[PDB]
Symmetry: D3
């Protein structure tokens, strides 16, 4: 489960986009689950090797790209 499964992070005006080794998704996404709104995550969606993630109120897409790039 080592996060070498992570193949790319990125973020725009709306959401943070982590891409993964074919089949990570739900594992890498299960991880971000620990962060919650308090740690800057409003929600999270997985899908194939694509995971979105829009920041909670009080955090910016960047605030997010940061503390997440942090838990990685």
């Amino acid at each position: 489960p080592l996060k070498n499964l992570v193949l790319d992070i990125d973020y725009n005006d709306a959401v943070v986009v982590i891409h993964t080794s074919p089949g990570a998704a739900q594992l890498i996404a299960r991880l971000l689950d620990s962060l919650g709104k308090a740690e800057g995550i409003l929600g999270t969606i997985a899908g194939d090797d694509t995971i979105f993630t829009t920041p909670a109120n009080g955090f910016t897409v960047k605030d997010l790209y940061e503390a997440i790039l942090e838990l990685f």
Copy 2:
């Protein structure tokens, strides 16, 4: 699948997120698909128990979180 399978509903600049009792996500998702552009629901995608819905042009997030929150 009582609305009460909905653990929460918050939003942000881009999307209105719902969080469900494990596995209910898509059942609630199927409910949103009943509204569509009609009610300013341009699109909606479910994951684990995290919904990601987004407003139609001429609609805002508060408007969404106002009409989904009204459906529940």
Copy 3:
């Protein structure tokens, strides 16, 4: 894989949103995955049969739209 399966393609101030025929999302979502960050594809999370895709920093939602419509 004929793109008549794509019921809708439309957008908002946040992501392009394609509506496909029952169960076509995961397929159509394969094409959008081909474009990559090179064409402004920041991400594409598929779902039931609704596809959420968003613009790589540098492009606009409105500029990804016209583009999908094109590589479609």
Copy 4:
């Protein structure tokens, strides 16, 4: 999640098959998981709205079909 989201229950010589209402698969799926091997469930895989469920190993399919049937 009232068990009227199920539409039918059947079984052949290898799995119990629950065909449910749109997008309810995950939930009813969510229920059977509480009856691990001990009550006869070696495994269960949910879907679109169909559910495969197979017997532990001391329970014929018929054994499982019944237990399930009782469980709802």
Copy 5:
């Protein structure tokens, strides 16, 4: 949505198994969905690019193979 997508069809003494060009999985799945109990299918479950489909009793998996092939 052309049946050029179906990359494989063989069966064992339990379920028939369709293999595809990744993605179709779901689309392909939903077509079989037209056969029903009556045409010999008790159910179907799919995902990535594999479709499992088991015969309704009174049908031998062999008898399903010839029926799915009679769609495909």
Copy 6:
């Protein structure tokens, strides 16, 4: 990626049933996807925390159980 994501492995007559830590479902089935009829995995449909894999012709569920065990 590590195989300590597999929470158990059992089987019977039809399909082998491998469980896993939350999310791990998909990833682990990958290793599997790299088995082929050659080794005896006729197909593997997995989802959530259960991977069902079935044996190809000429391989007992036990013999395939074997396969996963060595490959695992």
